[PDB]
């Protein structure tokens, strides 16, 4: 099964048996894609374990198998486990019971409902700003994903449930808690490392009632959700029940994917953007310019004023650039094809290298370097939608990608109205990127605040 | 009566006595929307006669009437009469019974009822390509109205009685084009306007707008089609407190509705395709893809395919066969910073929002890449409503997409559209009542 991509006429590294190309996973997925991209050009194959997976890097058939032939060929992703209950979550569910649950989920993440959550939103902004005055005004360096990911919990417990769970905090609120030990794909874990290159105890795992969430997280937030549901304003929560009256238990995995997503990679990026703010003032002064412009007297943000602001999207789109948090995008080919001529072999997972291609220079001037200019309606049209794909493409995209835009620039505004930010030294020049499995720094993200 | 606007201090055009600013009409209700909208920004208001006509385009102000305030403020539409029996009709009833029968009548358009349509309605499709077929191997110029609007008959008296009538002459589509036309020179829905107040009179009186042999004909018809699960079915079990008048009221609506809604943006849809060939091309290129070897167009497939919602989506757009949105305000309210006194119907230009140079770049072209999904996230839900918005909104939104794009499937799948001369280019408006071309839309078919 190590000889497919011999056979097919498709460069790759030379697999070991049984573990395949898992070992060059020690520098992480980033440095292994950027390597094998400059290594073998536009198309090359390794594989997981015994799993192959094809790398593709063309334009045109990166929009074949996310747009062109999603509902036909390109229609799940890998399959993950064990999950248990939460194989019905939308990000995990197949075939038939994914279109059922995009369709059902869609409604949520309108203009319309989007809306709806600004005046809710505001709320927690000026909480976040209140929480950073007390660490500002006592010279005290900042932590930022503990206070950005308090904010984003609030948030999500807020637009999707209508609860108040961290009422002004409460640092030790038990969901932040149990929220950032969901899961953590860790390769030095012999777990995961035995998951992708021994994938046939998977139902072995399942009957033997594993989870690689932990049962007492799932539990708090099982038991949560039929806390939460008793007895509106129209809200994820609430679409899902009058269409129930699903079960109380796919209602209960689509809530945790929802709850993870919007404060993991809410609080990641938002740390991400400070971080490059900070090495780069001439960049977070140009961007406080802005602010006071649209906003004067430090106006509250609302939804029209946030879509005006077409330095702050700039910002946003070029540390989404350097830090795209999904780092691989990965289709499963359910069945034989010949895409933009290419055969492509039944059960092959085609992987788009999402982190390389965002620094290929072949397409971008300077790669490594913070540059805003990238995404200015004078140079935004120079970009392929296809290549820099931060939150995917196609009919299985992100489905809160219009929410994590609004609320991170929500929060980037009323934050950027009263605080300028500064390196501390002890703050991690140059940023080192996790070499593990998920995208994040190292070091924890530390910057002086200093008020305005 | 006519210093309503003068007092509040809305802006708005001088009303002529007893007429009021029906004169400014010469042109059309679009032409009027646009140039008050130019003129008299944002909030104006004009007299439809004696009526005070307070038009909207805030968007936050659209949504208030349209959704948040509809059952307890802007629940029924302008009063229209004479009517007779067609009181019970659901786009005419008001307060208690619209709420019952909105209740009522809501089910038939599910997405289990429309996915149950689908092999019914791709009979159809197969005649709507026969029947053009021979008017194509001929080179003979089409009306598309003609043979668009045989092919929506079948489907409303399909999926809604259950029988099968057009095969040329029918009855059924012969009297529904003639149910109502709205025509302003035509001195009867005029003077209705400028005189109101004369509505009750020809009640008592037993007149009513929509023709008696046209009504007599429906009226019957319903009678002969319910001799013993589908919108006739649904009713009937409740039946069994809908009564043998209100259940003919609401079949004339979807027959109407069903009939000349679908032909006419359908031939709206192939005249843009026809100007703009590089769109039909692109549109003929995703049909083959979705559905290769001219496979028949399932429910799924419908929904897939991103440029065909993309084409009926911008023909939507230009042209908004309902013009306008209505609603009565029944008390006096203060909503988004704006007194509104009781009895002033509020209005929405809808045409006039879909050609805003504040909202759409070169708003007079034919463009369907505004609502690909990359910039479809600047479209405001409440500046293109084609469909409207809130509780009552458009019942049939559901069903009258599917069928306009399982019929522009099954037709773009076999011939191409280019014009004929003859073909008006650019296509005049009806400078009359409501939104239709002057000239009908003729092109030329040619099979693939
Ligand atoms: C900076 C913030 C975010 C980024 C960069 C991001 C990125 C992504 C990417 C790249 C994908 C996969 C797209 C593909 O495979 O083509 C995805 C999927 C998904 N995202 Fe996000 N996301 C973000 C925030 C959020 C938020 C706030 C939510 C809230 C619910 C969310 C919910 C989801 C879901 C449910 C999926 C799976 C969709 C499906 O399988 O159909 N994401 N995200
Ligand atoms: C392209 C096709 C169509 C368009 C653009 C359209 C548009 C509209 C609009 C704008 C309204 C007014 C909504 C409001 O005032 O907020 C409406 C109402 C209505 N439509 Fe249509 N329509 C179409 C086809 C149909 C079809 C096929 C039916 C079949 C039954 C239908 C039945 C109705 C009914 C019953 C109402 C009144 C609902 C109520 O008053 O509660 N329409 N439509
Ligand atoms: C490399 C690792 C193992 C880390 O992840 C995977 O391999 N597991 C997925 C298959 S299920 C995945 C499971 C999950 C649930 C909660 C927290 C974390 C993980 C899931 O539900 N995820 C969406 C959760 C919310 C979210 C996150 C980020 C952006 N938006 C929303 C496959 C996958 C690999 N990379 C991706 C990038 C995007 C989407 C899916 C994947
Ligand atoms: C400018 C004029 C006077 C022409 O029209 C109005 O002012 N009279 C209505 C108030 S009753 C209206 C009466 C009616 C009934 C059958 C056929 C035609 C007319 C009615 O029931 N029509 C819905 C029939 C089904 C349908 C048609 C088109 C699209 N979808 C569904 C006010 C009104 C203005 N625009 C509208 C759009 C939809 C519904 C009502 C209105």
New interface residues.
């Given amino acids: 099964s190590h000889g497919l991509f011999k056979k097919l006429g498709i460069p790759g590294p030379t697999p070991l048996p049984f573990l395949g190309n898992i070992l060059s996973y020690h520098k992480g997925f980033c440095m292994f894609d950027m390597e094998c991209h400059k290594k073998y050009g536009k198309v090359w194959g390794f594989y997981d374990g015994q799993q192959p997976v094809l790398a593709i890097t063309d334009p045109d058939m990166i929009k074949t198998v996310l747009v062109?032939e999603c509902?036909s060929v390109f229609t799940n992703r890998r399959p993950f486990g064990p999950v248990g209950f939460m194989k019905s979550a939308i990000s995990i569910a197949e075939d038939e019971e994914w279109?059922r649950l995009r369709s059902l989920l869609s409604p949520t993440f309108?203009?319309?409902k989007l809306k709806e959550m600004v005046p809710i939103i505001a709320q927690y902004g000026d909480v976040l700003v209140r929480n950073l005055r007390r660490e500002a005004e006592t010279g005290k360096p900042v932590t930022l994903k503990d206070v950005f990911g308090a904010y984003s919990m609030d948030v999500i417990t807020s637009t999707s449930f209508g609860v108040n769970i961290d009422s002004l905090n409460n640092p030790q609120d038990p969901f932040v808690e149990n929220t950032k030990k969901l899961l953590r794909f860790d390769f030095l874990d012999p777990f995961f490392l035995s998951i992708t290159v021994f994938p046939f105890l998977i139902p072995i795992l399942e009957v033997l009632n594993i989870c690689v969430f932990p049962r007492e997280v799932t539990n708090f937030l099982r038991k949560s959700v039929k806390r939460m549901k008793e007895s509106h304003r129209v809200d994820f929560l609430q679409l899902m029940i009058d269409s129930q009256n699903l079960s109380d238990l796919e209602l209960v995995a689509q809530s945790i994917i929802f709850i993870f997503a919007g404060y993991e990679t809410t609080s990641s990026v938002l740390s991400f953007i400070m971080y490059e703010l900070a090495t780069h003032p001439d960049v977070q002064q140009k961007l406080q310019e802005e602010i006071d412009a649209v906003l004067p007297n430090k106006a509250p943000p609302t939804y029209d004023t946030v879509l005006q602001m077409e330095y702050l999207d700039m910002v946003v789109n070029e540390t989404l650039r350097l830090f795209p948090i999904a780092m691989r995008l990965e289709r499963v080919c359910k069945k034989d094809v010949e895409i933009n001529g290419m055969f492509i072999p039944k059960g092959v997972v085609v992987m788009i290298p999402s982190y390389a291609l965002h620094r290929d220079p072949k397409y971008w001037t300077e790669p490594e370097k913070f540059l805003p200019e990238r995404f200015s309606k004078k140079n935004k049209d120079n970009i392929d939608?296809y290549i820099y794909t931060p939150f995917g493409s196609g009919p299985r995209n992100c489905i809160g990608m219009?929410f994590a835009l609004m609320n991170m620039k929500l929060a980037l505004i009323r934050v950027l109205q009263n605080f300028s930010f500064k390196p501390c030294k002890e703050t991690q020049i140059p940023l080192k990127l996790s070499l593990g499995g998920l995208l994040q720094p190292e070091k924890p993200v530390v910057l002086k605040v200093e008020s305005r």
Avoid: D, H, I, V
Wanted: hydrophobic share 0%; glycine share 12%; net charge positive.
């Fill in positions: 062109k509902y279109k309108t203009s319309g939608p219009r």
